[PDB]
Amino acid sequence: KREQTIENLYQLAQLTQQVQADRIEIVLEERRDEHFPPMSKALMETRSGLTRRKLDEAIAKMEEAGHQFTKNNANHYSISLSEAHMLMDAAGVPKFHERKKNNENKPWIINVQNQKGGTGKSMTAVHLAACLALNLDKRYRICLIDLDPQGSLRLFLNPQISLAEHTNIYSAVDIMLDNVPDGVQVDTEFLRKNVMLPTQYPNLKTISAFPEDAMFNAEAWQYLSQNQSLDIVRLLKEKLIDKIASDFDIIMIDTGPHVDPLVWNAMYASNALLIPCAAKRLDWASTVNFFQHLPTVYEMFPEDWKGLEFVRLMPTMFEDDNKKQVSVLTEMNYLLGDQVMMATIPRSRAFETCADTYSTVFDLTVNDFEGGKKTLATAQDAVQKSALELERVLHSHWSSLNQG
Amino acid sequence: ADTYSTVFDLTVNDFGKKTLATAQDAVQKSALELERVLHSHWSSLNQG
DNA sequence: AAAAAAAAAAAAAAAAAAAAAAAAAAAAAAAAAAAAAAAAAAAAAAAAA
DNA sequence: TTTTTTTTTTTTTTTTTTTTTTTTTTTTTTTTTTTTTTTTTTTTTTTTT
Ligand SMILES: Nc1ncnc2c1ncn2[C@@H]1O[C@H](COP(=O)(O)OP(=O)(O)OP(O)(O)=S)[C@@H](O)[C@H]1O
Numbered sequence: 001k002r003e004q005t006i007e008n009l010y011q012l013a014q015l016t017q018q019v020q021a022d023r024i025e026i027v028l029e030e031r032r033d034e035h036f037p038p039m040s041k042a043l044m045e046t047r048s049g050l051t052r053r054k055l056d057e058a059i060a061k062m063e064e065a066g067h068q069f070t071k072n073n074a075n076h077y078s079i080s081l082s083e084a085h086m087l088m089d090a091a092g093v094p095k096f097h098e099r100k101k102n103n104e105n106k107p108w109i110i111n112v113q114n115q116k117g118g119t120g121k122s123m124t125a126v127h128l129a130a131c132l133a134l135n136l137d138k139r140y141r142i143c144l145i146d147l148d149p150q151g152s153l154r155l156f157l158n159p160q161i162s163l164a165e166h167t168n169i170y171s172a173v174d175i176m177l178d179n180v181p182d183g184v185q186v187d188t189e190f191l192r193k194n195v196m197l198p199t200q201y202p203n204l205k206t207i208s209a210f211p212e213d214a215m216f217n218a219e220a221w222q223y224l225s226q227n228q229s230l231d232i233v234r235l236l237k238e239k240l241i242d243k244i245a246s247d248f249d250i251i252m253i254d255t256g257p258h259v260d261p262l263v264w265n266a267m268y269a270s271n272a273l274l275i276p277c278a279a280k281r282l283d284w285a286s287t288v289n290f291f292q293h294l295p296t297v298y299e300m301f302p303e304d305w306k307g308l309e310f311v312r313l314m315p316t317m318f319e320d321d322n323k324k325q326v327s328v329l330t331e332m333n334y335l336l337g338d339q340v341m342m343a344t345i346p347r348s349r350a351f352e353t354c355a356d357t358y359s360t361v362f363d364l365t366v367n368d369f370e371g372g373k374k375t376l377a378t379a380q381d382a383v384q385k386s387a388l389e390l391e392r393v394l395h396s397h398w399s400s401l402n403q404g
Numbered sequence: 405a406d407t408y409s410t411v412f413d414l415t416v417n418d419f420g421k422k423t424l425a426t427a428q429d430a431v432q433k434s435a436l437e438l439e440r441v442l443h444s445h446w447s448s449l450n451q452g
Numbered sequence: 453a454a455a456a457a458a459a460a461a462a463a464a465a466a467a468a469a470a471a472a473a474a475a476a477a478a479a480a481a482a483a484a485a486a487a488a489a490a491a492a493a494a495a496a497a498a499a500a501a
Numbered sequence: 502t503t504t505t506t507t508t509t510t511t512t513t514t515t516t517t518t519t520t521t522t523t524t525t526t527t528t529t530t531t532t533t534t535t536t537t538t539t540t541t542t543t544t545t546t547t548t549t550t
C-alpha cells in the first residue's frame with residue numbers, strides 16, 4: 001500500500017535535503033561585510049552623553065596610550081562601536097555590577113511572551129534589547145535568550161555567533177537534563193564556554209536555541225509519566241537561574257508565540273512579568289483567557305514563589321492612526337492604567353528593510369536606506385525612553401523584588 | 405460559436421434580448437447588402 | 453598661540469505619482485402596451501308542411 | 502306557412518414587437534500623500550602673524 005508514500009515521506013526528505021542545501025546557501029549569503037555605525041561628535045553627544053571636554057580629555061589620554069584614534073575620509077573624527085565600548089571600559093564609569101551604591105545585585109530578568117503569532121515579539125524585543133545595550137554610559141552585561149526554538153535572535157545581527165570553530169554545544173534542554181559529558185559537572189565556567197556567547201557587541205551576550213528544543217516538551221510529557229509533583233517547574237530554577245544569578249545583571253528572554261511547559265517554566269522561574277500584545281480585539285481576548293489560566297496554574301506551582309511583583313502590557317505593530325486600535329488602547333488604559341506602557345511601537349517600511357538585510361535599525365544609517373529617517377528616529381527614541389521607563393519600574397522595584 | 409449554434413436557429417424566445425435582437429438585425433441588413441452585391445456581380449456570372 | 457581660508461556636511465524648497473471619490477455612460481435586464489391573428493351571434497335566402 | 506345551412510356582424514385571447522426605468526460596470530477626474538534633487542548651515546585643519 002504505502003509504496004508511493006514511502007516515496008512521499010522520503011520525498012518530504014528528498015525535498016528537505018534540498019532545504020539542507022537552501023540553508024547552506026543562506027549561510028553563504030548572510031556572510032558580515034559591514035561596519036558598525038560611527039558616532040559623529042553629535043550622535044556621540046546624543047547617545048553616550050559624554051561632554052565634549054571630558055570626551056576630549058579621555059580620547060587624548062588614550063591617544064598618548066597605545067591605542068590610536070581613527071578619522072573618517074574627512075578629518076572629522078569618527079569612532080567605531082568597538083572603539084566606543086573600549087573607551088567606556090577605560091572611562092572608569094562603574095556599572096550596576098560595579099557601583100558602590102549597588103554592585104551586589106541579582107539579574108534583572110526581563111521577558112517577552114505573547115500567545116499571538118507574528119505580531120512583533122521577536123523583532124520588537126530584539127530592537128528593545130539592542131537599544132537598552134546602547135546604554136554605553138553603564139555597560140550592561142545582558143543575556144539575550146531566544147527560548148523560542150524558531151526565533152532568529154541567534155541569527156539576527158545580535159546573534160549567537162556559531163562560527164565554524166564552534167565545536168559542540170548543550171542548549172537549555174541539555175541544561176534541563178545535564179546531558180553534557182557525565183564526567184564533567186556544569187559549572188559557570190562551562191556556561192561561559194558553551195552557553196554564553198557574544199553578539200558582536202563587547203557588552204551584549206546571548207544564548208542560542210535549536211528545533212531540538214521542541215523535544216523538551218515531549219520529554220516533559222515523559223517526565224509527567226514518571227512524575228506527578230510537577231517538579232519540572234524548578235528544573236529551570238536550579239539548573240539555569242541559580243547558576244546564572246551569580247554573575248549577570250540582566251537577561252533578555254524571548255519565549256515564542258506559544259504557551260507550553262517550556263514557556264510555563266519561563267513564566268514561573270522568572271521574577272518579573274511583561275506582557276507583549278497588540279491593540280486588536282482577539283489579542284486582548286486571548287489575554288483574558290491568559291489571566292484566567294494563570295492564577296490556578298500559579299497555585300499549581302510551588303507556594304514558595306510569592307507572585308510576580310509587577311505586570312504590564314505592551315503595544316506593537318501600532319499604526320497609531322486606526323480608530324479601533326486606539327479605542328482598544330484607551331480601554332486598556334481605562335482598566336489596567338499604570339500597569340501598561342504608554343510608549344508606541346509604530347510600523348513602517350524601514351523595519352521591513354531592516355529585517356530583510358537582518359540588520360537592526362542601529363546597524364544601518366541614512367546612507368543605507370531611503371528617507372524613512374524620522375520614522376526610524378522616533379522608533380529608536382520611543383524604544384529608548386521605553387527601555388528607561390521599564391528599567392524605572394525595575395528601579396522603584398529594586399527595593400521590593402530583590403528582597404521578594 | 406461555443407454552443408455550436410448559428411445566429412438564426414435560436415430566436416429571442418430561445419433565451420441577449422435587445423442585444424441579440426440588434427445582432428440579427430445587423431446580420432440581416434448585412435445579408436441584404438451582401439445579396440444585393442450578389443445580384444450586382446451575378447448578372448456578370450450568367451454571362452461570364 | 454591665534455586668525456583666516458578652505459573643505460565635507462543638513463535643512464528647505466520644488467516637482468511628480470499613487471490612493472481615492474463623484475459623476476456619467478454602456479448595458480443589461482423584468483415589466484407593459486400596441487398590433488396582429490385565430491375563432492364566434494343576429495341577420496339573410498331558397499325550397500316546401 | 503315552416504325549416505335548414507351559410508355568409509356576414511362582433512367578441513375574446515395570445516404572441517411578437519417595440520416603451521420605460523433601474524442597477525452595475527467602466528471612464529475622466531483633483532486632493533492628499535509620498536518620493537527625489539538640493540542651497541544653506543556647521544565642523545576641522547593649515548598657514549601666517
Ligand atoms: N514594524 C514592523 N514592520 C514590519 N513588519 C513587522 C513589524 N512588526 C512586526 N512585523 C511582522 O512581524 C514579523 C516577524 O516579527 P514577529 O512578529 O516578532 O514574529 P513573532 O516572533 O511570531 O512575534 P509575534 O508572534 O508576531 S508577537 C515580520 O515578518 C512582519 O510580518
Ligand SMILES: [Mg+2]
Pocket residue numbers: 117118121122148256257
Ligand atoms: Mg514568534
